């Protein structure tokens, strides 16, 4: 018996107006007759269209990134701009931003804290690389990442936080986690939360699996006890995202 | 008898749906009696609103950044996405991106080249810091920056290129003119005199409705990339100053 599951679509840097409209239409026509929060994280460009067309009662829209405040930050989008635009969910600290776009543990923590303070529901991403899972220090890496985030939050703030575990070490080497391995990473995270934040928060916290999930593999991943849904990349651009939602039954 | 001037509004990371709509209404109601390309560079989020509402026949919309291709780049917007969305202008290599967000000379050059290949009009930004200027290396720095860009481009590509000179550190008309002349001279020398004659070099320092007229008077100034003042009614005066 778990907290409410989340099925989150990370469209990453993809989509045309037509391909995304067809996806949205599919989502809109889909019966979801169980309790789940579905999330569509579109590009900043596609937020207007997604707001306009996404009408399914079980779906909210999310941004894939942001900075804390408006200002002289050419090219960037701030939390007040998203809030003014009616967007109340955000994915922060994706492994790609940590790798490509200079986001350290602290920068992620600061973005998460600013987003919570501003009233967002936040999917905060953490996860070890292969270099680190090899030196016998998976635990060290992901717990250090979450500690950085926690440092800047109050106990009450965790109600608005969702953790997404990304096994970056698996990313594009064709190799995928066993459900046992996914469970172990999630259990390690929850145990840390129970221990440093509190058993209450830890029981309620959604920890989403953020490795490569598809329509075939989602059900047995969700069966694991500390898995509370998914942050989905590639398959979220496909009709099979509907099967992934159904797998959180 | 310069090339067609450009008055470009760099809104940076600013705006509400309300405040930006008010501004757009002002721009729409404005009479502009000369040939000038006005450009509104809004945040990605406000592109849809600006596309719908902005109707002045002398205005186009621009993005303030992009990456070259669609893919697994969470948080970013690619050139194909913008092109699908009907955005044909883009600002690239702005000092804040160079400063904060890892855009080296080569990265800027690659983005610029990809945007031209993709069919975009590109406002490519170059400019030296305060320390660079004070030590006397304005010329080395900005010519190195434009050389990196030119390295990734072909002659015919310069038709879709606009240079914004953005001294990162108020510039007298004389100091602005010197930087613009230095840039044009390099372009004449490397690409051809015909291309340098046609090239817009926009002044992208701190421009206001009050100082824009005398800056535009200089031989090699072809308009403006405007920061703070572009969020204000006085942007209309800045447009008028390109007469």
Q: Which long-range contacts (CB under 8 A, 24 or more apart) does A240-243 make?
A: A240/A214, A240/A215, A241/A7, A241/A9, A241/A23, A241/A27, A241/A215, A242/A26, A242/A27, A242/A30, A242/A215, A243/A215, A243/A218
Asked if B45 and A77 come within 8 Å (Cβ–Cβ), the reply is: yes
Interchain proximity A49–B47, CB inside 8 Å: no
Catalytic residue at B94? yes
Task: Name the token pair of B40.
Answer: 């509104």
Alpha helices in chain B (DSSP H): 17-29, 47-53, 79-84, 95-100, 105-118, 130-134, 138-151, 173-190, 193-198, 212-216, 235-240
How far does A67 lie from chain B, in Å, by closest CA?
A: 9
* Host domain of residue B208: 1-243
Resolution for this experimental structure (Å)? 2.2
The CATH number covering residue A225 comes to: 3.20.20.70
Q: What are phi and psi of B91, to 5 degrees?
A: -100, 130
Method: X-ray
Instruction: Pick the residue from chain B with its C-alpha nearest to A10.
Output: B74
Neighbours of B84 (CB within 10 A): 18
Dihedrals φ, ψ of B39, to 5°? -135, 130
| Residue of B18, B21, B51, B75 for testing the chain A interface, max A β-carbons within 10 Å | B75
DSSP assignment letter at B67 = B
Known active-site residue A186 = no
Beta pairing partners, A207: A163
Within 10 Å of residue A37's Cβ, how many Cβ atoms?
A: 18
For A168, residues 6+ apart whose C-beta sits below 8 A from its C-beta are A95, A99, A127, A128, A129, A130
Cβ separation of B81 and A13 shorter than 8 Å?
yes
**Is A12 marked within a binding site?**
yes
> What is the nearest CA distance from B155 to chain A, expressed in angstroms?
28
Token match 């904060």: residue?
A: B100
The DSSP bridge pattern shows strands A207-209 and A161-165 to be: parallel
Q: Which 8-state DSSP code applies to residue B37?
A: E
Of B48, B67, B102, nearest to A48 by CB-CB distance is B48
**Distance between CA B200 and CA B173 in Å, rounded?**
17
Query: With contacts defined as CB-CB under 8 Å, which chain A residues touch B82?
Result: 45
Cβ within 8 Å, pair B44-A97: no
Per this entry, what is the length of chain B?
243
Contact (Cβ atoms closer than 8 angstroms) between residue A31 and residue A3: no
Q: Is residue B10 a known part of a binding site? A: yes
Q: How many CB atoms lie within 10 A of CB B98?
A: 22
Q: CB A73 to CB B91 under 8 A?
A: no
Task: Quote the number of domains for chain B.
Answer: 1
- Please, what's the largest Cα pairwise distance for chain A? 48
* C-beta of residue B79 within 8 angstroms of C-beta of residue B47: no
Backbone angles phi, psi at B200, to 5 degrees: -80, 125
* Nearest-CB residue to B74 (from A67, A77, A91): A91
Question: Which residue in the list A94, A103, A132, A186 is annotated as catalytic?
Answer: A94
DSSP state of B78: B
DSSP class of residue A5?
P
Q: How far apart are CA B197 and CA B77, in angstroms?
A: 33
Considering only CB atoms, B14 lies closest to which of A15, A70, A102, namely A70
d(CA B61, CA B42): 8
How many contacts, defined by CB atoms under 8 Å, are there between A and B? 127
Is B98 within 8 Å of chain A by CB? no
List Cβ neighbours of A171 (8 Å cut-off, separation of 6 or more): A95, A212
* Catalytic residue selected from A96, A103, A132, A166: A166
Q: Where are the alpha helices (DSSP H) in B16-104?
A: 17-29, 47-53, 79-84, 95-100
């Amino acid at each position: 018996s778990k907290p409410q599951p989340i099925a989150a679509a990370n469209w990453k840097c993809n989509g045309s107006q037509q391909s995304l409209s067809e996806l949205i239409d599919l989502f809109n026509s889909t019966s979801i007759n169980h309790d789940v929060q579905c999330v569509v994280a579109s590009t900043f460009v596609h937020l207007a269209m997604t707001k306009e067309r996404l009408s399914h009662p079980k779906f909210v829209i999310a941004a894939q990134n942001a900075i804390a405040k408006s200002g002289a930050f050419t090219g960037e989008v701030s939390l007040p701009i998203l809030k003014d635009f009616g967007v109340n969910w955000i994915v922060l600290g994706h492994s790609e931003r940590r790798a490509y776009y200079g986001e350290t543990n602290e920068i992620v923590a600061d973005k998460v804290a600013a987003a919570v303070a501003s009233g967002f529901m936040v999917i905060a991403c953490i996860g070890e690389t292969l270099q680190e899972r090899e030196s016998g220090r998976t635990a060290v890496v992901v717990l250090t990442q979450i500690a950085a985030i926690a440092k800047k939050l109050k106990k009450a703030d965790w109600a608005k936080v969702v953790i997404a575990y990304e096994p970056v070490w698996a990313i594009g080497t064709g190799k995928v986690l066993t459900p046992q391995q996914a469970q172990e990473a999630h259990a390690l995270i929850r145990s840390w939360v129970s221990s440093k934040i509190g058993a209450d928060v830890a029981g309620e916290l959604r920890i989403l699996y953020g490795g490569s999930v598809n329509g075939k593999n989602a059900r047995t991943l969700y069966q694991q006890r500390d898995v509370n849904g998914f942050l989905v990349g590639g398959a979220s651009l496909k009709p099979e995202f509907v099967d992934i939602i159904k797998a959180t039954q």
